Design a protein around this motif. Structure first.
Motif, PDB file in Angstrom:
ATOM      1  N   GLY A   1      -8.187 -35.360  15.616  1.00  0.00           N
ATOM      2  CA  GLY A   1      -7.049 -35.347  16.604  1.00  0.00           C
ATOM      3  C   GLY A   1      -7.554 -35.677  18.567  1.00  0.00           C
ATOM      4  N   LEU A   2      -8.350 -35.129  18.786  1.00  0.00           N
ATOM      5  CA  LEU A   2      -9.164 -35.610  20.046  1.00  0.00           C
ATOM      6  C   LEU A   2      -9.069 -36.813  20.641  1.00  0.00           C
ATOM      7  CD1 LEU A   2     -11.474 -32.873  21.422  1.00  0.00           C
ATOM      8  CD2 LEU A   2      -9.446 -33.172  22.432  1.00  0.00           C
ATOM      9  N   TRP A   3     -10.308 -37.707  19.658  1.00  0.00           N
ATOM     10  CA  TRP A   3     -10.731 -38.709  19.910  1.00  0.00           C
ATOM     11  C   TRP A   3      -9.836 -40.007  18.898  1.00  0.00           C
ATOM     12  CZ3 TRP A   3     -14.019 -35.247  16.763  1.00  0.00           C
ATOM     13  CH2 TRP A   3     -14.442 -35.279  16.133  1.00  0.00           C
ATOM     14  N   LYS A   4      -8.817 -38.746  17.634  1.00  0.00           N
ATOM     15  CA  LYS A   4      -7.944 -40.075  17.627  1.00  0.00           C
ATOM     16  C   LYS A   4      -7.348 -41.182  18.357  1.00  0.00           C
ATOM     17  CE  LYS A   4      -3.952 -40.078  15.329  1.00  0.00           C
ATOM     18  NZ  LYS A   4      -3.074 -38.147  14.415  1.00  0.00           N
ATOM     19  N   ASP A   5      -6.769 -42.039  17.831  1.00  0.00           N
ATOM     20  CA  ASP A   5      -6.259 -43.011  18.890  1.00  0.00           C
ATOM     21  C   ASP A   5      -6.469 -43.008  20.640  1.00  0.00           C
ATOM     22  OD1 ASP A   5      -2.740 -43.193  18.193  1.00  0.00           O
ATOM     23  OD2 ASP A   5      -4.524 -44.243  17.259  1.00  0.00           O
ATOM     24  N   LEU A   6      -7.694 -43.175  20.977  1.00  0.00           N
ATOM     25  CA  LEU A   6      -8.306 -42.852  22.138  1.00  0.00           C
ATOM     26  C   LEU A   6      -7.920 -44.151  23.218  1.00  0.00           C
ATOM     27  CD1 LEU A   6     -10.151 -40.754  23.212  1.00  0.00           C
ATOM     28  CD2 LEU A   6     -11.959 -42.182  22.891  1.00  0.00           C
ATOM     29  N   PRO A   7      -8.020 -45.236  22.607  1.00  0.00           N
ATOM     30  CA  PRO A   7      -7.531 -46.796  23.947  1.00  0.00           C
ATOM     31  C   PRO A   7      -6.149 -45.911  24.072  1.00  0.00           C
ATOM     32  CG  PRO A   7      -8.521 -47.346  21.780  1.00  0.00           C
ATOM     33  CD  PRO A   7      -8.591 -45.947  21.602  1.00  0.00           C
ATOM     34  N   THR A   8      -5.332 -45.842  22.706  1.00  0.00           N
ATOM     35  CA  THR A   8      -4.179 -45.440  23.853  1.00  0.00           C
ATOM     36  C   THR A   8      -3.800 -44.838  24.741  1.00  0.00           C
ATOM     37  OG1 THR A   8      -3.095 -43.369  22.203  1.00  0.00           O
ATOM     38  CG2 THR A   8      -3.589 -46.523  21.562  1.00  0.00           C
ATOM     39  N   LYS A   9      -4.429 -43.738  24.518  1.00  0.00           N
ATOM     40  CA  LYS A   9      -4.789 -41.892  24.700  1.00  0.00           C
ATOM     41  C   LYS A   9      -5.323 -42.333  27.075  1.00  0.00           C
ATOM     42  CE  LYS A   9      -4.669 -38.409  21.987  1.00  0.00           C
ATOM     43  NZ  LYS A   9      -3.093 -39.056  21.069  1.00  0.00           N
ATOM     44  N   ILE A  10      -6.415 -43.307  27.088  1.00  0.00           N
ATOM     45  CA  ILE A  10      -6.852 -44.073  28.103  1.00  0.00           C
ATOM     46  C   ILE A  10      -5.743 -44.539  29.020  1.00  0.00           C
ATOM     47  CG2 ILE A  10      -8.552 -44.758  29.851  1.00  0.00           C
ATOM     48  CD1 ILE A  10     -10.675 -43.886  26.529  1.00  0.00           C
ATOM     49  N   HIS A  11      -4.741 -45.388  27.972  1.00  0.00           N
ATOM     50  CA  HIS A  11      -3.925 -46.184  28.299  1.00  0.00           C
ATOM     51  C   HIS A  11      -2.505 -45.257  29.391  1.00  0.00           C
ATOM     52  CE1 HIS A  11       0.348 -46.928  27.846  1.00  0.00           C
ATOM     53  NE2 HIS A  11       0.046 -48.393  28.621  1.00  0.00           N
ATOM     54  N   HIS A  12      -2.517 -44.197  28.809  1.00  0.00           N
ATOM     55  CA  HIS A  12      -1.479 -43.538  29.127  1.00  0.00           C
ATOM     56  C   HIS A  12      -1.616 -43.235  30.299  1.00  0.00           C
ATOM     57  CE1 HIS A  12       0.347 -43.993  25.346  1.00  0.00           C
ATOM     58  NE2 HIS A  12       1.753 -43.712  25.346  1.00  0.00           N
ATOM     59  N   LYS A  13      -2.834 -42.553  29.784  1.00  0.00           N
ATOM     60  CA  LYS A  13      -3.605 -42.333  31.494  1.00  0.00           C
ATOM     61  C   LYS A  13      -4.003 -42.851  33.074  1.00  0.00           C
ATOM     62  CE  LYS A  13      -4.156 -37.944  29.312  1.00  0.00           C
ATOM     63  NZ  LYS A  13      -5.756 -37.079  28.831  1.00  0.00           N
TER      64      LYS A  13
ATOM     65  N   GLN B   1      -5.193 -25.497   6.256  1.00  0.00           N
ATOM     66  CA  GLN B   1      -4.754 -26.846   5.319  1.00  0.00           C
ATOM     67  C   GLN B   1      -4.762 -28.348   6.040  1.00  0.00           C
ATOM     68  OE1 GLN B   1      -5.065 -27.265   2.174  1.00  0.00           O
ATOM     69  NE2 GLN B   1      -4.233 -25.021   1.709  1.00  0.00           N
ATOM     70  N   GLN B   2      -5.273 -28.443   7.429  1.00  0.00           N
ATOM     71  CA  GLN B   2      -5.472 -29.861   8.102  1.00  0.00           C
ATOM     72  C   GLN B   2      -6.646 -29.185   9.178  1.00  0.00           C
ATOM     73  OE1 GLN B   2      -2.079 -27.873  11.346  1.00  0.00           O
ATOM     74  NE2 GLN B   2      -1.696 -29.615  10.333  1.00  0.00           N
ATOM     75  N   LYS B   3      -7.294 -30.553   9.311  1.00  0.00           N
ATOM     76  CA  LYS B   3      -8.558 -31.104  10.068  1.00  0.00           C
ATOM     77  C   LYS B   3      -7.746 -30.925  11.747  1.00  0.00           C
ATOM     78  CE  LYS B   3      -8.947 -34.620   7.997  1.00  0.00           C
ATOM     79  NZ  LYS B   3      -8.888 -36.249   7.591  1.00  0.00           N
ATOM     80  N   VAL B   4      -9.090 -30.635  12.269  1.00  0.00           N
ATOM     81  CA  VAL B   4      -8.698 -29.346  14.073  1.00  0.00           C
ATOM     82  C   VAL B   4      -9.383 -30.397  14.798  1.00  0.00           C
ATOM     83  CG1 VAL B   4     -10.129 -28.187  15.003  1.00  0.00           C
ATOM     84  CG2 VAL B   4      -8.842 -27.181  12.780  1.00  0.00           C
ATOM     85  N   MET B   5     -10.445 -30.858  14.820  1.00  0.00           N
ATOM     86  CA  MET B   5     -11.208 -31.833  15.814  1.00  0.00           C
ATOM     87  C   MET B   5     -11.018 -32.710  16.154  1.00  0.00           C
ATOM     88  SD  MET B   5     -12.442 -29.133  17.965  1.00  0.00           S
ATOM     89  CE  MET B   5     -14.262 -29.661  18.897  1.00  0.00           C
TER      90      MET B   5
END
Ligand code: CDL
Ligand code: CDL
Ligand code: 3PE
Ligand code: 3PE
Lengths: 52, 70
Positions: free
Chosen positions: B23-35, B17-21
């Protein structure tokens, strides 16, 4: 009502169960010391058999 | 080796009942910012000694090569 009830045989039971039970989604509501009750994936997998 | 119950209340959802893949590329720039922001010290410590030693070795090798090359 009796005719409808005894018009249900084994094949009808299998067909209805396959319509309602085979590989469908369960909804679980539990409370208490349930720290040993299996999680959702467990039940969802138990809704079908791999032997048949 | 015992379990320690916590008295929580947990709502979970079916995996179908919920999409799977996404969230990998959702909100990518902030993820790279954190990393990059929370780890630049670690990368500096891991790579700085290596590149510095390589530069020193190449400098020394070339200077000796010139000196000994007649
Ligand atoms: C040793 C060799 C045998 C091992 C057998 C193990 C499973 C035994 C068993 O009965 O399981 C059923 C059992 C089914 O669950 P159940 O709760 O017993 O019953 C559920 C159903 O009511 C009943 O389940 P079901 O009816 O869906 O079927 C269960 C089982 C039942 O089997 C039978 O009834 C008879 C056998 C099949 C007959 C038809 C063929 O039948 C099958 O599995 C069908 C196989 C069909 C052929 C496939 C080819 O399987 C599991 O629970 C899953 C086991 C998962 C094991 C994973 C192991 C690896 C994971 C860790 C890896 C770590 C790293 C490894 C590498 C490290 C470096 C080397
Ligand atoms: C670039 C875009 C990456 C987009 C992406 O996937 O983002 C999600 C991912 C989410 O991050 P996360 O929240 O930590 O997720 C980790 C979970 O464990 C992820 O959980 P999971 O278990 O679902 O993991 C899924 C896995 C699944 O991965 C895949 O599906 C990708 C498989 C594609 C095929 C791979 C074929 C490889 C062929 C290699 C051939 C090599 C030839 C070499 C030839 C040499 C010749 C001299 O994907 C990842 O882990 C993400 C990509 C990892 C690789 C990059 O974000 C990134 O990968 C960020 C990338 C950038 C990081 C910072 C880089 C800074 C560089 C400064 C210089
Ligand atoms: C050409 C493109 C074909 C794309 C087919 C799938 C279309 C699709 O919906 O892709 C999205 C899906 C992930 O979707 P999801 O995470 O569920 O949430 C989004 C919901 N629309 O994306 C995926 O599921 C992609 C990851 C699975 C890909 C599996 C490929 C297996 C191929 C086996 C070939 C073997 C040959 C031998
Ligand atoms: C051949 C031998 C190769 C040896 C490689 C040794 C690798 C050791 C890995 C140790 C674990 C690790 O690197 O964790 C990631 C680390 C910090 O991550 P962590 O503290 O687990 O979590 C923070 C919150 N998410 O964060 C980082 O590592 C970020 C810095 C990476 C620098 C890469 C250059």
């Amino acid at each position: 009502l009796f005719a409808r009830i005894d018009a249900v045989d084994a094949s009808t039971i299998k067909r209805v169960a396959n319509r309602f039970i085979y590989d469908k989604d369960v909804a679980i509501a539990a409370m208490g010391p349930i720290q040993r009750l299996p999680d959702y994936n467990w039940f969802r997998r138990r809704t079908y058999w791999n032997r048949y | 080796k015992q379990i320690v119950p916590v008295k929580s209340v947990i709502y979970a959802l079916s995996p179908f009942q919920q999409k799977v893949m996404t969230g990998l590329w959702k909100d990518l720039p902030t993820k790279i910012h954190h990393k990059v922001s929370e780890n630049w010290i670690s990368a500096t410590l891991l790579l700085g000694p290596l590149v510095g030693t390589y530069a020193y070795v190449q400098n020394y090798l070339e200077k000796e090569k010139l000196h000994h090359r007649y």
